[PDB]
Amino acid sequence: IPKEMLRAQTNVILLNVLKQGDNYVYGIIKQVKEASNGEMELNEATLYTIFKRLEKDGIISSYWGDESQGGRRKYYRLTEIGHENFRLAFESWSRVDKIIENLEANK
């Protein structure tokens, strides 16, 4: 599959992950691994590049987690704008799916 497609897929997964709850890079990787039965292993560097893109664009913000169990983890959260970007992405992709269904029916 093209790199552009894989990247678009990662962008959609990450918006969904943060919509569901603040999360940190190695929690995201680990959880996407299980949700994919080990099929998808995201790379740290991909996540940082995307997270710089989203953070500059105001879609995510970051804060430090509880260090009580050891380790200061940087968490990421969807901002309120980022929730709207989430809805928009979700809705437009849903429309893409109907378009494709309808194109089958058109002929």
Added chain:
Amino acid sequence: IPKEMLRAQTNVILLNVLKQGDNYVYGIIKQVKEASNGEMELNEATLYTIFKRLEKDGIISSYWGDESQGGRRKYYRLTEIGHENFRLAFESWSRVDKIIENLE
């Protein structure tokens, strides 16, 4: 929504159109416009640009349609690799949906 995401969506739609049947650019724009009740207007230059790359990449081939009514239409057809791409894209996007459900 970001440009990169619209482009990925157009790429998914285009692969599906050509998988569904050979087709030409103006017909694709019109059909996608109808399938979307007028909400999606694919940009001609975008389609032509994507199709040029796909054609050089051996993913689609092209041929001229009947000119008996006076119209020169260039049709595009999925090659065997193009059918292979359609499946990968369809399957990998399906696995994405699967992942997102599970995360909740």
